[PDB]
Every structure is written in structure tokens, then in C-alpha cells.
Design a protein around this ligand. Structure first.
Ligand SMILES: Nc1nc2c(ncn2[C@@H]2O[C@H](COP(=O)(O)OP(=O)(O)OP(=O)(O)O)[C@@H](O)[C@H]2O)c(=O)[nH]1
Lengths: 55, 75, 73, 96, 83, 79, 111, 486, 72, 81
């Protein structure tokens, strides 16, 4: 049924750097300060836009 | 241990080294046969007889001679 | 640890009450793990209240049944 | 094993030969009473397992305040087998 | 090591008011300050009953462990998380 | 600090005459000159005069060893 | 709080080492304080067999340098165990467009 | 439904009998009134959680998410910034096992909210100060040292987030030691600058600073860690050991005694060799060789985990492994118990500072004695709204006397004097509660020295108010209104 | 003269042991051990100085013993 | 050797004991411990001079004991091993 997976850490430590072209190297979530899902909701409940956000 | 442990929470009568008697509800014992008796009476002996009350008595093990059961448990 | 916490009492002026109904009064400086004391300016309190002076004395630990301060910690 | 070196050589050898010979040995308890015995084993605490025993003492209780001293003529009751806690001992003889 | 339940309840007793009777027959009644694992107590501010009747007050006292033959611990301890 | 096992050693080196009080037996004292301590405080007393204070008289003994558990004080007196 | 993780570039270096990006600790006790350090040889010695708890085992192993780095990996890579998903559900390109990409790119893609 | 707060309907299971808590409250020497303060996100709230998790067995953290227990407001949880000073009362054991009562006023760390600190500061006897090990002293840490010292509380400092050294910065032990020692020295400099007293120098040797990582439930003083050391190997005078484990004291393995001089140029310090390095080896096995050598390591530490626990993710697993090793936060207790004075002892400086009549007044003498049977004098400094928002409960310290349910009390507002009685009102006291952050225990009475929530007296009270008997203490006066930090 | 060498010295001499309970024994000692139990040979028992009898080849148990003195 | 271990093999036979303070118990025995702590069941007491008493179960501390009184129903020879 292929439901659950359990890997050792040498496996994970390899797979991570194979994937490395796709991933972004942000270590922490401070970047998205007024650029996360919650900020946009405020920009939609008011009628007023964030500069780079959606409309 | 296992014979003593059977007695726990009953109402136990102790006879001290000097001849005194205590009667108490029994909840602790130790490798030196220290005791904690609780809700306890000091009791001495028509030949006159008398009954004093004590609380939460901690008995240094050296004194103890014998102990006996006479009650069902204060449940 | 095994030593008595007698550290407080040192150089303050003690009374002792010893086994067999004996009394001595002292300025203290000793203890070891058995509570063997070394007393200084040590007065002996005889039954009749006739008092002796005696010099520095050792006490065996098991002989004590109380150790009282005549002037505070 | 090491106690055997002690019990052959030392002061406890009094007890050791008392088993082998089966001489009687006259013990003096702390309650004044004497136990005379044929010791059948022991340990370093002076614990003993005694036989053929006769426990001899004058019986003059404290109760009398002068009455009980009327009774110096003694007693001898015969206990067939008897274990004895060691610390009850003050001294011990050999009888031969 | 297995220092059992009673001596823990003794440590639990500290800072209250306990009564404490010695071999000789003197009865002490005092506020506890510290108690050691062999039951050496220190006690403060005592009202002592002598063997023959007389009362006295005392500043501070230290009572050798093996010289005791009961304490009267203050009743509220019966609830304590040792029990 | 003055440890007691140190103090008793100073009484050895002086070779002093010390007076011992016995456990329980207040009416008797021993009054010895001294060399001795295995760790139990067992003393060896050379003079060792017994002082039976009801009689006041003073009975005399050899070079005696005074077993530790009998002791209480350890007073200093003259020769 | 700013996660401060220092990416070790090459595995030759010991996993715990004062990497040059970290500002050197200027502190060295100049006005040297005389706090209550007990006197030398003041009757304290340890029993025969006490030791630092894990002294038989090395401070670091070759996996230690790599294994720390997983702790700040993105959500599927930072865990030892999970539950399998459908191939439909994994949004492979999602991380890119959630970040405000550098404006020098043409107008067309920005919108 | 208006139920915008996370209050628990039902009383959770506690390790202790609730009757035992009330009994302890009479014994004025056993209770300690601390306040935890320190700069934003230095880990105060998550530390308190580890106490609650230790104390309330049914309550456990979620693996994915912090259990911000004292953050009771949705607003407060949405922001992720603490905004209200929330009190917690728990009994938790010392190394000796002796149980003490702690009233822990968890306070915000954001600079603007500092109001909340000062109110909880007034009713407390002592500060615990939390410093992030990675960042060290920051803006609001320096402000709170200055404020506390002026208020004449005892101070003790706690160094949080030690794990950040090991896992983020990857500092080797010896340099990590220097990072700790730097923090300690800066704090000492600040205190000694403000405080005219000099006896309050704080350093790990004296017990009054402790090292903790609150994410992973690590807390240890030098005394506490040696207690772990002694209960393993046996026959160590652990208090004498704890003196020798900090600063420039080096271990000589040939003579097996400590010396102030390094026996070889590579001889690591007593701190590094005994405290830091086995801490490092615990963490670097768990986050490192969890597959290959972690079971072997756990054998030596005496820790046993089931086959279901060993499949956890690394962050839950690390918290679990340490929780078995260190156990209870007893080290924190030893620091608080010894250095922070009990209300008996603490009454005299507290009355002297806060009371306009001073200690020379008869009531001042009576309050300094902290007698539960003395004249009632209660000080309220905080107001907390009801679950519905309709009412407010006054919160305060029973600085003398005893408050009873249904008792009629005279409430003195901040402008009251013997020449102007118009700022006073007589109120009927409703229900009283001992406060714990998410559930409230109702009680019949509260004796002197403890904290209490008071219902129905809130009408005449604007901010601070003094609560006193209507017919006895006719010469009572208010306590000084709070001198805010800004 | 420490106590351990001393007791080896008195071996085989005449010695006179006095017990706490006020009895006393005269004896030619035969050994001593780690706890200072003792044996005596050809012994007399004194009780207030009465020569009670020739108690053969006694053993004494160490907690009983007060001083031991040597005889001219 | 180690006679206290002989005082555990003896279980569920019958004994008198005299304690140190002139007390006598008469009992059947179950349980004994390393420090000679005795427990008897079916217990008849006699204090010093005072009259008999009979008790269900009695537990006697080790260091108060003096002589037992074994029954003649022991063949002794088994104790050597
Ligand atoms: N690395 C590390 N992070 C922690 C630790 N403890 C808490 N944190 C994180 O630090 C952040 C701050 O925690 P809080 O305790 O809620 O913040 P605070 O210290 O109470 O300060 P306020 O928000 O003003 O109330 C949270 O994201 C925690 O997850 C820790 O021990 N180690």
C-alpha cells in the first residue's frame, strides 16, 4: 500500500543535494514579512494593494 | 519487605522500647524501620489507664519492639 | 555529605548537655563527621553549682544529646 | 573461607573446639542468667545454636519492695533446642 | 541511594513548627530550620518542657539524630506528594 | 579549624596528664598520661589512677588501654 | 529570531570549528576578576572511576557536519519519517513564484 | 459565540494534591514571588511551558508547534508577541525534594509593552532575567536591569537558548565557553554601574545564574549538573564539586585534583571538560548518528527508549532524550530559593520603598511582620477582563491580613489621603481565585504573602488601589502609583 | 606505643581485664583480633575483690571491655 | 555459617521467643529478613508478669530478640548445607 516511509539520515543527506537546483536556500521565514498569505488577506479585506503582491 | 507491605494503610498498634504504646494509621517504612504513623493515639496503662492524642508521628527506628494489626482499613 | 552542618555555630558561645546529666559551657571550634567537638574556655557545671575552670577539651560524638547557643549565631 | 583462618587461630577458637569435642560451655547472658550448652554452630557475631540447656538464676523481681528477696533458692528449666542472638553475650567459659 | 519516604517527609517538614522528644524525657517545641539525613535537627525559638514540669524558652538548639524518639510533624503534610 | 584527632595528637607530644570522664559512670574518672590513637579514639594511659570520689582515695593501675566507646570528655590537668 | 546557521562549505574541516564568518570573540579577561575559586589542594579529590560522561565517544563524526544541516532544510527534507503523497499533490515549482524575483527580468514574466 | 480566549473548562490532572497547595500558602517562608523579564523572543514563555509540562502530566506540547501556555489571547497568539503579563502559580520541587510555592509572573519582552513588566515587578520580590546565548545582551535587557535594581529587588539571570551555540553557530566548546563568560561579565558591569551595593555580584560559582535550553527542556545550575554526576557515580560532596566547575580551574587527571594552573597546554577547563563536552556529545549523536551509534550512547547514559520513540523526528526526539537525562528543572529552584528572599524577609525593603507613611507608622511595622492575622492591607496593580469582556477582576498581593469571601472592604483610590477621603468606596468582595494562566482554582480565603484575583471590587479602581478594613485601620494610606520606565 | 603493637606485646604476660558491669578477670591472655575480642588462660574472677573461683579458659566479647591492665 | 540464613529455612514450624525486655511471644512463623526481623502469625503474647493476650499477626523488630525456643521436631542435621 506504500503509505509510510522511514529513511536513515545518510539517505536524506544525499536526496537533499540532488534536489538542490529546485530548492531555495532561505534558512528562515523572516523574508516574507509582508509577503505571506496573511498579509495579502489584509490587502484584500481592505481595498488597498501591496506593491509586489497580487491584485 | 513483602510481609510488612501487606500491613500498609491499616490501623497499627506499636509497642515502644520504654513500655509505651502508640496506635496509628500506617503510611511509610524504611530500611532502618523508621515509621510514619498517622491519626494517632498515645496510650498507657481498677488499674488506672489513659489515652493521649498525637499527630503524624515519625518514629526513629531504634525504639520499635513490635507492631500489630487491629482494624479493617480506614479505606 | 556526611559532616554535620555545624559550620554556623563556630566561635559563638555554646552550652552543651551531656549524657548522664552533665553540663558544660563553651566557645566552640571543632567538628568532624562524628560530631566530635573541640570546646574552648570550657566551664564544668557540677551538680551543686560549684563551678570549675578547665582548658581545651575533646568530646566524643555519641555523648551529646543537645547543643545549645548561649549567644546567637 | 577467610573466617575459618580467624576461627581456628583467634579467640573464637574457644567455640570452634567446643563443637568438635562437644564439651559443655557456660555462657553468662546480660539478664544475669547463665546458659550452659553444647554449641552446635556459630558465626562471628557470637550467635549460637544450643542444646541440652539449663538456665540457672535467682528469681528476685523488683515488684516486692522487700518481699521478693525471700526467694534465693533457684530454678533450672531444661530447654531442648535454642538459638541465641549474639549480642546477649558478655563472656563465655570452657568447662573442662 | 534509597533514602526512603520518612526522611523525605522530614525535609518536607522544615520551616513549620514541630515537637520533638529525646531519650531523657525533655520535650522540645520549636520551629525547624534544617534537618540532615541522619536526623540531626537544628531548631529555633523553642519552648521546652523539662522531665519534671518546668518550662523554659531558648534561642537556638541543635539536636543529635540518634537521641530522638519521636517527632510530631504538622498534620497538613498528610496530603504531600511523597504520599 | 581545630580538628579533634589533631588536638589529641598535640596531647601526645606534650605527654600531658589528662583526665577522662566515663560514659554514664559520673562517679569515676581516669587520669592518665598518654600515647595512643587508633581511629576509634582508644587511648593507652600509663599512670591511670582511678578516682572513686565517694571514698576520695586513689587506686592505682598499670599501663592500661582505655577502649574508645567508654570516653566522654578529655580534660587537661596538672601532673 | 534570525536563524544564524553557518553553512560549512567543504567536509574536510571539523564539524565544530570557529568559521571565519563568525566575528572573533574580542573578550579576554583584562581586569581579571578574583571570584571565589577554592584554593589549590583544599582536600577535594574525585573517586577512582568518575569520568566525563561520554568520554569514550568522539566529539564529532563524519555524519555530524551533514546531519546538523538537515535541521534547516525545507519541509520534506528536514524529517526522518512522513507519509507518502500522490504525485498530483506535490507542487514542484511552488517555492519560486512565492518570492519577489529580481526586477531585471523582462516585464512579461513579472506579471 | 464571543469565546475569543483559550480558557479550559476542566481542571487538569496535577502531580500534587490541591489541598497541599492551600496548606503551603499559610507558611509564608515557603512561597517565592518571582517575575521573569528580559528582551523580546529570548524564550521566557517557552520556558514556563516546560514547567507546566513537568507539573501537569496530561498537558503535552505538539511536535510541530510551540505550546505558548501563557499566551491566552488570540491577538497575542496571532502576533506571536506577548502583550499581557500573565501570572502562573505552581508548586515544583527542589533537588532536596522539598516543595516550594512559586508565583511566576510571566511578562512581555517587547519594549513598548514594558508597562506589563512594571506592574508584575511591584508585586514580585525578585527578577529572573532571560538572555539568548547567541545574541547576548540587547536593548531591553539593559533597560530591565536598570529598572529592577532601582526597585530594590534581588536579581538573578538565566542564560537561555544554549542549543543555538551548538547547532546554529557550530562553535567549538572552548570558544562557546568564552561566549557564556562574555554575557556574565556584561551583566555584572551594568549592575555594578547602577547599584550602589556591591555584594550582589552574580557568577555561576555562587549559584545565581543557570544555563538552559527551553526548546529541548534542558535546565541546569552547576549544582544541579553535579547532582546528576553524583547520583550516577556515588560518593561525591556535590556542593563542593559545583564550586570547582567554573572559570580558570583545570583538572589534572594524574593527581585527580583541581588546580588553577593548566598542567599541559592542551588541558581543557573544568567547565569545558565536564559540562560542555558531554552536552555536545549528546546533541551531536542525536542530530548526527541517530541510526548507527545513538542506541550504544543511550546505554552509557542509563536512558532507555522504546522502539516507537526511536522513530520520532529529530526535534521531538532530542527534547525527549534530554528530558530523561536532566529530568526536572530543580536547578532553577535552587537559584530562586536561596537568592530571592521570602516575603517575611522581603517585607521590610518592600514597605520602605512603596508606602507613603513609611516603616515608621504602626501599620508599617504590622505589614513588615507579614502577619496573616494582622490588619488587612492588600495592593492591586493589574486588571484582567472576564471571558465575556463584561467585568474585570482585580489582581494583587495580600501584603498583610487575610481576604475572605463575602467580606466588606474599603477600597482606597490613588488620590486618597487623610485630608481627602473622597477617593474611597466600600465594596462587597465576591469570589476569589488563585490564578493559573488557563484555569482558575476558587478558594475560600487567601493568607498574607500570596497573589489573588478579586471579583466585584473593580468599580472604584482606575489603576492601582489599596484594599483595607472599613472600620479598623482608619489611618491607612495608599501605596505610591507606579513609576513607569518610560 | 600505638594500641595495635601494644596488644601484641601483652601476649602471654599476666593481664587483668575489667568489665563495665564491675566484674573483673585476671588472666594470662592468649590472642587478640581485629575487633579486640580476647581469650584468657588460667583465669580468676573477682567480684568486689572476692576470688569467686577458677573459671577455666575463658573467652571475653569485645563490647564488654573497659580497660585492660598488666600485672607485675 | 551465616545462621540468619538458617532462620529463614525454619519457616512454618512453631516457636516460642523471649524478647529482651522479658516479653514472650508464642507463634507460628512466616517471613524473616537479613536483619533477623521476625513476623509471626497465630500469635499468643505474655508480657512481663501481666496476663496473656492472643493476636492474629505480630511483627517483631530484629535487635529486640534474645533466645528462640525451637521444637524437638527439628532433625538438626540438614543445617550443615
Ligand atoms: N533555538 C531556540 N529557540 C527557542 C527556544 N525557546 C523558544 N524558542 C523560540 O523563540 C521564539 C520566542 O519564544 P517566546 O518564549 O514565545 O518569546 P518570549 O521570550 O516570551 O518574548 P515575548 O514574545 O515578548 O513574550 C519562539 O519562536 C520559540 O520557538 C530555545 O530554547 N532554543
Amino acid at each position: 500500500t506504500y503509505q509510510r516511509w522511514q529513511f536513515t539520515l545518510p539517505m536524506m543527506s544525499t536526496l537533499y543535494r540532488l534536489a538542490n537546483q529546485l530548492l531555495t536556500d532561505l534558512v528562515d521565514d523572516n523574508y516574507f514579512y509582508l509577503f505571506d498569505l496573511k498579509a495579502f488577506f489584509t490587502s484584500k479585506a481592505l481595498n488597498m494593494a501591496i506593491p509586489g503582491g497580487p491584485k | 519487605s513483602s510481609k510488612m507491605l501487606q500491613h500498609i494503610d491499616y490501623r497499627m498498634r506499636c509497642i515502644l522500647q520504654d513500655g509505651r504504646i502508640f496506635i496509628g494509621t500506617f503510611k511509610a517504612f524504611d530500611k532502618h524501620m523508621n515509621l510514619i504513623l498517622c491519626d494517632c493515639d498515645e496510650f498507657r496503662k481498677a488499674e488506672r489507664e489513659e489515652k493521649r492524642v498525637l499527630g503524624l508521628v515519625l518514629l526513629r527506628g531504634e525504639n520499635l519492639v513490635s507492631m500489630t494489626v487491629e482494624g479493617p482499613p480506614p479505606k | 555529605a556526611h559532616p554535620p552542618e555545624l559550620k554556623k555555630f563556630m566561635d559563638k558561645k555554646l552550652s552543651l548537655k551531656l549524657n548522664g546529666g552533665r553540663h558544660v559551657q563553651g566557645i566552640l571550634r571543632g567538628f568532624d563527621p562524628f560530631m566530635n567537638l573541640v570546646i574552648d574556655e570550657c566551664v564544668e557545671m557540677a551538680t551543686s553549682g560549684q563551678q570549675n575552670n578547665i582548658g581545651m577539651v575533646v568530646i566524643r560524638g555519641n555523648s551529646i544529646i543537645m547543643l545549645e547557643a548561649l549567644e546567637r549565631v | 573461607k577467610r573466617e575459618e583462618e580467624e576461627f581456628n587461630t583467634g579467640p573464637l577458637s574457644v567455640l570452634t573446639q567446643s563443637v568438635k569435642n562437644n564439651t559443655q560451655v557456660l555462657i553468662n547472658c546480660r539478664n544475669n542468667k547463665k546458659l550452659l550448652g553444647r554449641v552446635k554452630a556459630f558465626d562471628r557475631h557470637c550467635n549460637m545454636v544450643l542444646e541440652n540447656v539449663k538456665e540457672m538464676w535467682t528469681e528476685v523481681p523488683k515488684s516486692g519492695k522487700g518481699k521478693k528477696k525471700s526467694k534465693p533458692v533457684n530454678k533450672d528449666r531444661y530447654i531442648s533446642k535454642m538459638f541465641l542472638r549474639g549480642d546477649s553475650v558478655i563472656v563465655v567459659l570452657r568447662n573442662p | 541511594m534509597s533514602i526512603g519516604v520518612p526522611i523525605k517527609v522530614l525535609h518536607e517538614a522544615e520551616g513549620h513548627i514541630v515537637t520533638c522528644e529525646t531519650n531523657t524525657g525533655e520535650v522540645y517545641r520549636g520551629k525547624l530550620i534544617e534537618a540532615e539525613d541522619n536526623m540531626n535537627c537544628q531548631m529555633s525559638n523553642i519552648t521546652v518542657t523539662y522531665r519534671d514540669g518546668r518550662v523554659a524558652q531558648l534561642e537556638q538548639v541543635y539536636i543529635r539524630g540518634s537521641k530522638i524518639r519521636f517527632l510530631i510533624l504538622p498534620d497538613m503534610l498528610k496530603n504531600a506528594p511523597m504520599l | 579549624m581545630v580538628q579533634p584527632i589533631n588536638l589529641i595528637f598535640r596531647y601526645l607530644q606534650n605527654r600531658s596528664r589528662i583526665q577522662v570522664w566515663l560514659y554514664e559512670q559520673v562517679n569515676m574518672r581516669i587520669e592518665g598520661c598518654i600515647i595512643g590513637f587508633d581511629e576509634y579514639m582508644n587511648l593507652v594511659l600509663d599512670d591511670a589512677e582511678e578516682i572513686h570520689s565517694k571514698t576520695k582515695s586513689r587506686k592505682q593501675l598499670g599501663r592500661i588501654m582505655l577502649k574508645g566507646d567508654n570516653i566522654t570528655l578529655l580534660q587537661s590537668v596538672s601532673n | 529570531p534570525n536563524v544564524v546557521f553557518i553553512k560549512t562549505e567543504d567536509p574536510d574541516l571539523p564539524a565544530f570549528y570557529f568559521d571565519p564568518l563568525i566575528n572573533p570573540i574580542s573578550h579576554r579577561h583584562s581586569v581579571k576578576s578574583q571570584e571565589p575559586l577554592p584554593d589549590d589542594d583544599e582536600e577535594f579529590e574525585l573517586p577512582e572511576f568518575v569520568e566525563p560522561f561520554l568520554k569514550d565517544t568522539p566529539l564529532y563524526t563524519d555524519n555530524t557536519a551533514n546531519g546538523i544541516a538537515l535541521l534547516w532544510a525545507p519541509r520534506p527534507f528536514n524529517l526522518r519519517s512522513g507519509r507518502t503523497r500522490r504525485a498530483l499533490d506535490i507542487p514542484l515549482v511552488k517555492n519560486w513564484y512565492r518570492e519577489h524575483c529580481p526586477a531585471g527580468q523582462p516585464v512579461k514574466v513579472r506579471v | 459565540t464571543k469565546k475569543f480566549t483559550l480558557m479550559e473548562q476542566t481542571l487538569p490532572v496535577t502531580v500534587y494534591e490541591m489541598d497541599f497547595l492551600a496548606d503551603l500558602m499559610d507558611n509564608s517562608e515557603l512561597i517565592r514571588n518571582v517575575t521573569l523579564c528580559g528582551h523580546l523572543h529570548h524564550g521566557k514563555t517557552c520556558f514556563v511551558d516546560c514547567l507546566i509540562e513537568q507539573t501537569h502530566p496530561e498537558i503535552r506540547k505538539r511536535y510541530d508547534q510551540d505550546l505558548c501556555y501563557t499566551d491566552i489571547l488570540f491577538t497575542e497568539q496571532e502576533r506571536g508577541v506577548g502583550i499581557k503579563s500573565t501570572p502562573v502559580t505552581v508548586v515544583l520541587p527542589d533537588t532536596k525534594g522539598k516543595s516550594y510555592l512559586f508565583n511566576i509572573m510571566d511578562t512581555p519582552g517587547h519594549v513598548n509593552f514594558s508597562d506589563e513588566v512594571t506592574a508584575g515587578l511591584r508585586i514580585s520580590d525578585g527578577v529572573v532575567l532571560f538572555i539568548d546565548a547567541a545574541e547576548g545582551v540587547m536593548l531591553n535587557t539593559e533597560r530591565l536591569i536598570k529598572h529592577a535594581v532601582q526597585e530594590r529587588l534581588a536579581v538573578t539571570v538565566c542564560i537561555n537558548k544554549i542549543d543555538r551555540l551548538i547547532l546554529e553557530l557550530k562553535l567549538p566548546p572552548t570558544d562557546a565557553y568564552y561566549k557564556l563568560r562574555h554575557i556574565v561579565d556584561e551583566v555584572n558591569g551594568l549592575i555594578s554601574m547602577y547599584s550602589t551595593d556591591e555584594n550582589l555580584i552574580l557568577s555561576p560559582l555562587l549559584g545565581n545564574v543557570c544555563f538552559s535550553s527551553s526548546q529541548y527542556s534542558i535546565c541546569f545550575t552547576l549544582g544541579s549538573f553535579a547532582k546528576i554526576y553524583a547520583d550516577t557515580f556515588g560518593d561525591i560532596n556535590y556542593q563542593e564539586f559545583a564550586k570547582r566547575l567554573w572559570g580558570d580551574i583545570y583538572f589534572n587527571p594524574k593527581t585527580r585534583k583541581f588546580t588553577k594552573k593548566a598542567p599541559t597546554s592542551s588541558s581543557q577547563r573544568s567547565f569545558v571538560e565536564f559540562i560542555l563536552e558531554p552536552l555536545y556529545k549528546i546533541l551531536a549523536q542525536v542530530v548526527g548518528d541517530v541510526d548507527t551509534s545513538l542506541p550504544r550512547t543511550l546505554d552509557e547514559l542509563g536512558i532507555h527508549l522504546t522502539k516507537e520513540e526511536l522513530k520520532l523526528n529529530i526535534r521531538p526526539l532530542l527534547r525527549l532524550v534530554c528530558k530523561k537525562f536532566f529530568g526536572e528543572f530543580t536547578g532553577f529552584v535552587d537559584m530562586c530559593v536561596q537568592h530571592i528572599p521570602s516575603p517575611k524577609v522581603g517585607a521590610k525593603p518592600k514597605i520602605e520603598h512603596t508606602y507613603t507613611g513609611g516603616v515608621d507608622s504602626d501599620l508599617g511595622e504590622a505589614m513588615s511582620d507579614c502577619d496573616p492575622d494582622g490588619p488587612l492591607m492588600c495592593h492591586t496593580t493589574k486588571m484582567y477582563s472576564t471571558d465575556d469582556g463584561v467585568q474585570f477582576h482585580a489582581f494583587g498581593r495580600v501584603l498583610s491580613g487575610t481576604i475572605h469571601a463575602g467580606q466588606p472592604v474599603k477600597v482606597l483610590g490613588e488620590n486618597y489621603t487623610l485630608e481627602d477621603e473622597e477617593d474611597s468606596q466600600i465594596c462587597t468582595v465576591g469570589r476569589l481565585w488563585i490564578s493559573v494562566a488557563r484555569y482558575h482554582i476558587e478558594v475560600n480565603r487567601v493568607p498574607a504573602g500570596n497573589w489573588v484575583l478579586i471579583e466585584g471590587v473593580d468599580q472604584p479602581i482606575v489603576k492601582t488601589a489599596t484594599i483595607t478594613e472599613p472600620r479598623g485601620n482608619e489611618e491607612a494610606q495608599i501605596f505610591r502609583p507606579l513609576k513607569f520606565n518610560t | 606505643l600505638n594500641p595495635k603493637p601494644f596488644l601484641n606485646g601483652l601476649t602471654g604476660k599476666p593481664v587483668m581485664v575489667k568489665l563495665k558491669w564491675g566484674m573483673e578477670y585476671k588472666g594470662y591472655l592468649v590472642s587478640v583480633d581485629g575487633y579486640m575480642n580476647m581469650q584468657l588462660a588460667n583465669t580468676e574472677e573477682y567480684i568486689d575483690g572476692a576470688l569467686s573461683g577458677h573459671l577455666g579458659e575463658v573467652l571475653i566479647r569485645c563490647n564488654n571491655v573497659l580497660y585492660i591492665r598488666g600485672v607485675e | 555459617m551465616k545462621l540468619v540464613r538458617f532462620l529463614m529455612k525454619l519457616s512454618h514450624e512453631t516457636v516460642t521467643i523471649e524478647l529482651k525486655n522479658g516479653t514472650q511471644v508464642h507463634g507460628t512463623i512466616t517471613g524473616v529478613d537479613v536483619s533477623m526481623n521476625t513476623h509471626l502469625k497465630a500469635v499468643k503474647m505474655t508480657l512481663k508478669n501481666r496476663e496473656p493476650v492472643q493476636l492474629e499477626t505480630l511483627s517483631i523488630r530484629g535487635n529486640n530478640i534474645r533466645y528462640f525456643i525451637l521444637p524437638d521436631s527439628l532433625p538438626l542435621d540438614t543445617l550443615l548445607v
